[PDB]
Amino acid sequence: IRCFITPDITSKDCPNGHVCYTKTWCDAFCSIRGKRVDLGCAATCPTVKTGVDIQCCSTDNCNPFPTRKRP
Ligand SMILES: [Cl-]
């Protein structure tokens, strides 16, 4: 599967991966710089601790980097 990967934010081939993932959470700068985003690929949808969100998908490049919409 092909997925976007942080910190390059480029699409990479994960020949042995099955899903892409988007992990987001707030650090101390979340108000001014938005959530931190970790994009990657995995054989299965990884697990995240409390306060961290993860959305997994199973098609090439289905985890585009989500920027914050600027009002
Ligand atoms: Cl985590």
Author numbering: 1 to 71
What does the paper say about this structure?
Here, we use a panel of human monoclonal antibodies with neutralizing activity to long-chain α-neurotoxins (LNTxs) to investigate pH-dependent antigen binding.
To understand the molecular mechanism for pH-dependent antigen binding by A01, we determined the crystal structure of the A01 antibody in a complex with α-cobratoxin at different pHs. Accordingly, we determined the high-resolution structures of the A01 mAb produced as a single-chain variable fragment (scFv) in a complex with α-cobratoxin at pH 6.0, pH 5.5, and pH 4.5 at 1.49 Å, 1.60 Å, and 1.55 Å resolution, respectively. Further analysis reveals the presence of additional hydrogen bonds, cation–π interactions, and a charged hydrogen bond (salt bridge) with the side chains of residues Arg33 and Arg36 on finger II, which occupy the center of the paratope. This interaction is facilitated by a hydrogen bond and salt-bridge interaction with the carboxyl group of Asp95aCDR-L3. While the interactions facilitated by Asp95aCDR-L3 and α-cobratoxin are equivalent at pH 6.0, pH 5.5, and pH 4.5, Asp95aCDR-L3 is present in the light chains of chain-shuffled mAbs A04 and G09. Protonation of His34CDR-L1 in A01 was accompanied by a significantly increased water molecule network around the histidine imidazole group, which enables the paratope to adopt a greater number of conformational states that are unfavorable for antigen binding at pH 5.5 compared to pH 7.5 (c also).
